[PDB]
Amino acid sequence: XXXXXXXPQVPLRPMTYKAAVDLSHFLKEKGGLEGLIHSQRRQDILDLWIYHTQGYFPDWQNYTPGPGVRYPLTFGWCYKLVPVEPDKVEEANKGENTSLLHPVSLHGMDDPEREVLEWRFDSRLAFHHVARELHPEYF
């Protein structure tokens, strides 16, 4: 998936609804992100790549607080983070060969609400700015 592909050069560009929507699809077309477990290092890696290649300053990708689904502040970004069910986390961590520092093993240390999160793609986010509705304070 694209996280493998990612894992300054270009001039600055503003983040716009068009920018975010195109970007969402650009990542989907390159395969990836959907279903992928969230870790701060991963997003940092992602934010940087977008930043270096496509000149979007890594400030745009923010989500509503937990617990529960975390919704993107930038309108037209079609990726929400949703919490993994506990039983799913435990089954994934089963076994003595799983890496200690793999994102699923961290158990949401990166998250203040300590929830394990995965990226999921939503069509609706392009049409409806869920973050604004839920938290006008941020807007």
Binding site: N93, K94, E96, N97, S99, L100, S105, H107, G108, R114
Partner: protein, 142 residues
């Protein structure tokens, strides 16, 4: 000071244990069991610290393993919390993508690592570079 370091898997098998205080086997076993009870039941919702009458527990979970440092009440909660990660990261670098299995097969080596980083109930070496360099040097030795 650090009363004792514990590395325990979810099942309750003890991967590592360092005692920096005197305990008799009856006490240790009660402690191991007591510590397991608290962390497995305790969730994400909860803080990383658990409070005892005499002692405090700082613990963090990686994979199937619970890393627990037991300290006196006045000790720095956050510092020891991050000391655990510093330790895990050193282990990660050392075993190259460390996992619980590595801790079992190379158990005699994990003691070496802990001792570089913690000694006498205190923090010893906090530089990943220096611990790793020393760890590498020793490998060369017969």
């Amino acid at each position: 000071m650090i009363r004792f370091i514990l590395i325990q898997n979810r099942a309750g098998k003890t991967r590592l244990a360092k005692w920096y205080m005197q305990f008799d086997d009856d006490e240790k076993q009660k402690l191991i069991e007591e510590v397991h009870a608290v962390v497995t039941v305790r969730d994400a919702k909860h803080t990383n610290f658990v409070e005892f009458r005499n002692f405090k527990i700082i613990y963090r979970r990686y994979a199937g393993l619970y890393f627990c440092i037991c300290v006196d009440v006045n000790d720095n909660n956050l510092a020891y919390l991050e000391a655990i990660h510093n330790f895990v990261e050193v282990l990660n670098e050392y075993f190259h993508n460390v996992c619980e299995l590595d801790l079992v097969f190379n158990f005699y080596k994990v003691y070496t690592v802990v001792d570089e980083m913690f000694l006498a109930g205190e923090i010893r070496e906090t530089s990943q570079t220096k611990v790793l360099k020393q760890l590498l040097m020793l490998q060369s030795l017969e």
